[PDB]
Curated annotation (Swiss-Prot), chain B:
Name of the protein this chain belongs to: Nicotinamide phosphoribosyltransferase
Compartment list: Nucleus; Cytoplasm; Secreted
Catalytic activities: beta-nicotinamide D-ribonucleotide + diphosphate = 5-phospho-alpha-D-ribose 1-diphosphate + nicotinamide + H(+)
Keywords recorded for this protein, A-Z: Acetylation, Biological rhythms, Cytokine, Cytoplasm, Glycosyltransferase, Nucleus, Phosphoprotein, Pyridine nucleotide biosynthesis, Secreted, Transferase
Organism field: Homo sapiens
Keyword Lipid metabolism: no
Entry superkingdom: Eukaryota
Disulphide-bonded residues: none
Amino acid sequence: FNILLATDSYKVTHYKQYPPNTSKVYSYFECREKKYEETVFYGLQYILNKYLKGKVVTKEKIQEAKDVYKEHFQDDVFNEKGWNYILEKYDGHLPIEIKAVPEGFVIPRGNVLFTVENTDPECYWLTNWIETILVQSWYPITVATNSREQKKILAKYLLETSGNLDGLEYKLHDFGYRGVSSQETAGIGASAHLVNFKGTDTVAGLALIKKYYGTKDPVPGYSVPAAEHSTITAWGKDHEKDAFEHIVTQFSSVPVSVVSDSYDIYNACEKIWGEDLRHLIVSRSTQAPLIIRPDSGNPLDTVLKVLEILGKKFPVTENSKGYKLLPPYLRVIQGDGVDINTLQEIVEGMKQKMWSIENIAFGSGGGLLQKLTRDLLNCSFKCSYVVTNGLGINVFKDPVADPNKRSKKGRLSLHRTPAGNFVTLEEGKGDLEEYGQDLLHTVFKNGKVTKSYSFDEIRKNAQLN
Amino acid sequence: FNILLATDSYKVTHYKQYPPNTSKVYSYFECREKVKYEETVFYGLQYILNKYLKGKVVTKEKIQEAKDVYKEHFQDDVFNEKGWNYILEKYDGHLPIEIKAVPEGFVIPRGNVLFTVENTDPECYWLTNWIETILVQSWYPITVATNSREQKKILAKYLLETSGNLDGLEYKLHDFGYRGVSSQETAGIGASAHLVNFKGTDTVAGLALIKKYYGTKDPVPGYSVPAAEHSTITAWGKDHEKDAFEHIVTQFSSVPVSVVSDSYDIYNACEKIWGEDLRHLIVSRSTQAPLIIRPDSGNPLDTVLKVLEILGKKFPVTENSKGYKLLPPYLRVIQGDGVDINTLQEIVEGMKQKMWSIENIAFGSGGGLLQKLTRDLLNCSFKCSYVVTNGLGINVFKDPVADPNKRSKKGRLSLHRTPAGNFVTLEEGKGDLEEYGQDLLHTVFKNGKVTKSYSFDEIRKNAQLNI
Ligand SMILES: C[C@@H]1CC(=O)N(C2CCOCC2)N=C1c1ccc(NC(=O)N2Cc3ccncc3C2)cc1
Ligand SMILES: C[C@@H]1CC(=O)N(C2CCOCC2)N=C1c1ccc(NC(=O)N2Cc3ccncc3C2)cc1
């Protein structure tokens, strides 16, 4: 990895475009305000450690970048001297100071989340060089936020239909490993989901958390044995029952998920699970349920019909809230077509049919880790303050046709209001001590990580009310 | 990187689930059949084969790590240590797998086999689908390359209709997506996939990926020019926008320069700053070094049309041989906000209805080009179609009652040209009848070795448009 090659091309040319005698460029990140009213701040620590800290500039990395940019631009516009300055003066450590809200913090839209500034006047150009790498923090923020919004929906309907939150942290399982754009993305996104839940198939998330954050537990997320279409269909179309019997017998004393829609989900539920193999299901322990997995058709209609079938083949109870509950050896997971909208539709449709949310879990792949963009929370990095000829000026954009893109002015700070909410003060007004101390902390300075959070602290910060 | 930790957790348990006495699992990848996206660019497998699958990928230390992690993750011992140990001792940790694939850059209709995977040692029946997770990530380069090519087709059609040729087509869609993707690795992969179709990119990560895994005869596969951002304009102060514009076009007076012009008022900047105060610095520029005015907010169509209306009243407009208006060659526009395949179509159609040549415009696309895409868009999918159990081959498949679109193919597969020059996927080993020409799938990986490679230049040639 070469930080000289990890920016937008046009930023290679920005050192020639700032006003003459600019000593300071100060920039900030927010989730701009215009429904996702509050964001989980997560993922900066990964970027600081993997890409920004320590000796990130070498002679060899400068020469590589020079040679690439000469061909890319068909011109010699690369700031070799500026990068050489960093190498010679700071042994290739970035003269940058980053301040940030603590990881796992849940902050309303339109607040400063981190600030960046150069600590050496020669390095005014470096603040926005690193915009591109720091702005990728959009992805872990957005995955963590959207996963937390789904947790709130599951909390609401579980509480209403059961009277408690038992099992909440296992109700949304990450299926997204194959559905993301890269190995690196898999680890980052899986880690962000694990801020809110404990259930994952995206193995890449475990090593990221252990290396960059840390937990008291041996692992931050868990799984159970489960079938796929290849392990049922390999038995032959006339042997689906044989495949089911073998799998639940092999995994007789742990939970096991069995995809049941290879040929006919309703037949598999009513006749195979509900008659032919029923004797192998009703004998299982509460710690080792069969989890029936549909994987096709309209997600709500399919869940409701699977539950109607099982309720007629298995002994159903009525819990203390008046909702129907399968026996504890039998559960359903809907792992197809699940995103925040269909999850809401399913739990609402289950509640209207008097089915406890105790009965159901969700798996989500592309919905959870891939079908998300930087536009969803308007994640954005902007210059708000410069010093030119020794005078500080408040800088901002304010496009005539889009007031939502107006950016904040001057030196920023994050404060508690007298009612306990968050406010971002602009124009250096934090320095009036009318709202108490800045809630941002220095997390990076001059090539060193100066403040960090365990994954356990982050989960506690990200908790639901 | 540890291939034993690079699968879906549940695949760790599949070796206990297949039928006993299974010697072979054969699986295939397609972009299942139902902007229709009728044809896909096959691109990106060679990256995965070289970075993750080839050579000694199993060691004692990787087996023990995986065992230790899975013990805690499952709260249970279920990991196939014996099976992984077998690969280490028998093959020096090289995967006993054969992958056959259509050549990279090939443009194939939906619902065709694009690659197959099978074990070459009967002990390793479980390994075929272990690597499903890593191989199915090929959805991303296929989908970026396909969606970028579908945008090239729209640009080609409107450029040809409004100008009578395709000059500059390979620079009309610029990759702005480095900050808008989910990781560094994704930036390189996605940027490389766009460069199959175009030559302009700011996503620098794409260049090193292509040089290391594919290679070009050119020194670099993609190019850029100087451009402003809001920080380099707004740093001058709100009353000095004109001073920022003047300094930037003067610094970059002999190359193309893109200047974001919407910091405060895009329409004032076009009419009064570029169109009056700094007009003398624009009309003096060479055809090889235009000013490129960049709006970046508002309704993308409305803003492009109004910018062109303003510039056409301040600068000498010609009418080309097709009857479309054309700015002078020292002045162009780039719309780089809110661009995806739908808004690109809307803008060029709106420009054509207002009699503006597509020669006047270029597009930048970030999240639309590299991020706002899922594995669902082309139904990219890997499925088992053939097993051997007690020495007898059986054709296998799924066919869910409530969704016929998820039916999978049966048996040993091959891809052929039809007598009319289309493509057909033969099932149930019927390729062996040789009623069609040669199978188009070639062995690209066997027993830990990459057996066939494509240059980036071959890939671009295979992915060309018809015209
Ligand atoms: C959601 C239920 C409920 C539940 O409480 N658990 C916990 C998980 C922690 O250990 C004790 C049981 N696991 C569950 C569960 C876990 C994994 C699976 N896996 C699953 O169906 N698949 C893995 C996977 C990955 C990618 N595509 C499809 C699938 C199918 C299914 C149910
Ligand atoms: C599309 C026009 C037309 C065109 O023919 N070119 C080619 C490119 C190859 O070299 C000669 C000129 N470049 C163009 C161009 C290149 C880069 C830019 N860059 C740009 O506006 N920005 C880079 C970038 C990245 C991330 N977010 C925003 C921006 C803004 C704009 C126009």
